């Protein structure tokens, strides 16, 4: 039947990939944040157990207040991990989700409508003499018209891809913010333990 | 029956706590490393999925090579997390495990032997005239002797607690090493994305 130019085709492939990537990347980033939460929880637990025994054991010794120093340090890291979840979630996931329920969905729609209009024209073309020229003409009009709409929505999404890179950036952003935030917490308690071991 | 001085008692309590702490702390640190591995895995997956779609999508655009830049960055972080597991495991867990199968176990043993010898003396004391003085004397000798052995092993463990603090330090060590190691990886790719978004 009717065939679409290669440009249109390549443009479609890219949109496809993009759409599928945004799909998996998003699901796996969610699975990722699941385990992050899981670890974050376990962290806080270990942290408490420390703050706890460091209590019971008493502070007249060394291991007692140390379990307390490392204790809170561990728990603060824990809370920073939670902040990270929230960051990734609303600055990377949500945007991609919105891209999928808005732009990608709409493209998919136009593409379906284009296919329908294409098939319908190929059919009405088969019966050229049988059907009134006006009807055929419209069939062709509708096809061209749908092709144009699909080309625009696809093109606009593909041309705005620098924003996907901003989103990837957003992820790496919150990522770096957490690790830097943590290097502080740790580096701090890493000096307090340096003391004790020195007041040895 | 026979009672042990308060110093001996307090010394016993501390040893108890310490022993129990080293127990939970260790189990929870293991549960912690479990989830760390779990997240680490999920990270690498997301990382691959990126390196993948960034491939398929192609590099003639922006999102393609970006998914590749953030792609490996994510995977390298993943591998650093694995290094961290190994660190915590052999520089914090293993030491504590050895403390539990060596020093703590031995104390527990001495303590049991002390109890036996105590109970046995209280019994042989009940039957003072009934049993030969020599036997009673030995019973007392054995008790004092076991008490001394228990006091030494407990005291030595409690006096060497600065080493627990070194271990806590070891944990916080590997912890800080990972986060600093990561701040690099990220900070790096955080500048490469700065470029693309600038060559916009």
UniProtKB/Swiss-Prot annotation, chains A, B:
<comment type="function">
    <text>Implicated in synaptic vesicle endocytosis. May recruit other proteins to membranes with high curvature. Required for BDNF-dependent dendrite outgrowth. Cooperates with SH3GL2 to mediate BDNF-NTRK2 early endocytic trafficking and signaling from early endosomes.</text>
</comment>
<dbReference type="GO" id="GO:0042802">
    <property type="term" value="F:identical protein binding"/>
</dbReference>
<dbReference type="GO" id="GO:0042995">
    <property type="term" value="C:cell projection"/>
</dbReference>
<dbReference type="GO" id="GO:0031175">
    <property type="term" value="P:neuron projection development"/>
</dbReference>
<keyword id="KW-0966">Cell projection</keyword>
<keyword id="KW-0597">Phosphoprotein</keyword>
<dbReference type="GO" id="GO:0048471">
    <property type="term" value="C:perinuclear region of cytoplasm"/>
</dbReference>
<keyword id="KW-0472">Membrane</keyword>
<dbReference type="GO" id="GO:0005886">
    <property type="term" value="C:plasma membrane"/>
</dbReference>
<keyword id="KW-0446">Lipid-binding</keyword>
<comment type="subunit">
    <text>Monomer; in cytoplasm. Homodimer; when associated with membranes. Interacts with OPHN1. Interacts with SYNJ1. Interacts with DNM1. Interacts with MAP4K3; the interaction appears to regulate MAP4K3-mediated JNK activation. Interacts with PDCD6IP. Interacts with ATXN2. Interacts with ADAM9 and ADAM15 cytoplasmic tails. Interacts with BIN2. Interacts with TMEM108. Interacts with ADGRB2.</text>
</comment>
<dbReference type="GO" id="GO:0097484">
    <property type="term" value="P:dendrite extension"/>
</dbReference>
<dbReference type="GO" id="GO:0005769">
    <property type="term" value="C:early endosome"/>
</dbReference>
<keyword id="KW-0967">Endosome</keyword>
<dbReference type="GO" id="GO:0008289">
    <property type="term" value="F:lipid binding"/>
</dbReference>
<dbReference type="GO" id="GO:0000139">
    <property type="term" value="C:Golgi membrane"/>
</dbReference>
<keyword id="KW-0770">Synapse</keyword>
<dbReference type="GO" id="GO:0098974">
    <property type="term" value="P:postsynaptic actin cytoskeleton organization"/>
</dbReference>
<dbReference type="GO" id="GO:0048488">
    <property type="term" value="P:synaptic vesicle endocytosis"/>
</dbReference>
<dbReference type="GO" id="GO:0098793">
    <property type="term" value="C:presynapse"/>
</dbReference>
<dbReference type="GO" id="GO:0042059">
    <property type="term" value="P:negative regulation of epidermal growth factor receptor signaling pathway"/>
</dbReference>
<dbReference type="GO" id="GO:0005829">
    <property type="term" value="C:cytosol"/>
</dbReference>
<feature type="domain" description="BAR">
    <location>
        <begin position="1"/>
        <end position="200"/>
    </location>
</feature>
<dbReference type="GO" id="GO:0030669">
    <property type="term" value="C:clathrin-coated endocytic vesicle membrane"/>
</dbReference>
<dbReference type="GO" id="GO:0099523">
    <property type="term" value="C:presynaptic cytosol"/>
</dbReference>
<dbReference type="GO" id="GO:1905604">
    <property type="term" value="P:negative regulation of blood-brain barrier permeability"/>
</dbReference>
<keyword id="KW-0963">Cytoplasm</keyword>
<dbReference type="GO" id="GO:0043409">
    <property type="term" value="P:negative regulation of MAPK cascade"/>
</dbReference>
<protein>
    <recommendedName>
        <fullName>Endophilin-A1</fullName>
    </recommendedName>
</protein>
<keyword id="KW-0728">SH3 domain</keyword>
<keyword id="KW-0254">Endocytosis</keyword>
<keyword id="KW-0175">Coiled coil</keyword>
<dbReference type="GO" id="GO:1990416">
    <property type="term" value="P:cellular response to brain-derived neurotrophic factor stimulus"/>
</dbReference>
<dbReference type="GO" id="GO:0007417">
    <property type="term" value="P:central nervous system development"/>
</dbReference>
<dbReference type="GO" id="GO:0098794">
    <property type="term" value="C:postsynapse"/>
</dbReference>
<dbReference type="GO" id="GO:0098684">
    <property type="term" value="C:photoreceptor ribbon synapse"/>
</dbReference>
<feature type="coiled-coil region">
    <location>
        <begin position="134"/>
        <end position="200"/>
    </location>
</feature>
<dbReference type="GO" id="GO:0002090">
    <property type="term" value="P:regulation of receptor internalization"/>
</dbReference>
<dbReference type="GO" id="GO:0010629">
    <property type="term" value="P:negative regulation of gene expression"/>
</dbReference>
<dbReference type="GO" id="GO:0007165">
    <property type="term" value="P:signal transduction"/>
</dbReference>
<dbReference type="GO" id="GO:0005737">
    <property type="term" value="C:cytoplasm"/>
</dbReference>
<dbReference type="GO" id="GO:0098978">
    <property type="term" value="C:glutamatergic synapse"/>
</dbReference>
């Amino acid at each position: 039947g009717t065939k679409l130019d290669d440009d249109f085709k390549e443009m479609e492939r890219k949109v496809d990939v993009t759409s599928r990537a945004v799909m998996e990347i998003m699901t796996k980033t969610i699975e990722y944040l699941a385990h992050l939460s899981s670890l974050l929880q376990a962290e806080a637990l270990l942290a408490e157990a420390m703050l706890k025994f460091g209590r019971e054991l008493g502070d007249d010794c060394n291991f007692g207040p140390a379990l307390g120093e490392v204790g809170e340090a561990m728990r603060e890291l824990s809370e920073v991990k939670d902040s990270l979840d929230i960051e990734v979630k609303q600055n990377f996931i949500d945007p991609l989700q919105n891209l999928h329920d808005k732009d990608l969905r709409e493209i998919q729609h136009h593409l379906k409508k284009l296919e329908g209009r294409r098939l319908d024209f190929d059919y009405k073309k088969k019966r050229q003499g049988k059907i009134p020229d006006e009807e055929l003409r419209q069939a062709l009009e509708k096809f061209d018209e749908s092709k144009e709409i699909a080309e625009s929505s696809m093109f606009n999404l593909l041309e705005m891809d620098i924003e996907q890179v901003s989103q990837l950036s957003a992820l790496v952003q919150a990522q770096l913010e957490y690790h830097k935030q943590a290097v502080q917490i740790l580096q701090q308690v890493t000096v307090r333990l340096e003391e004790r071991i020195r007041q040895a």
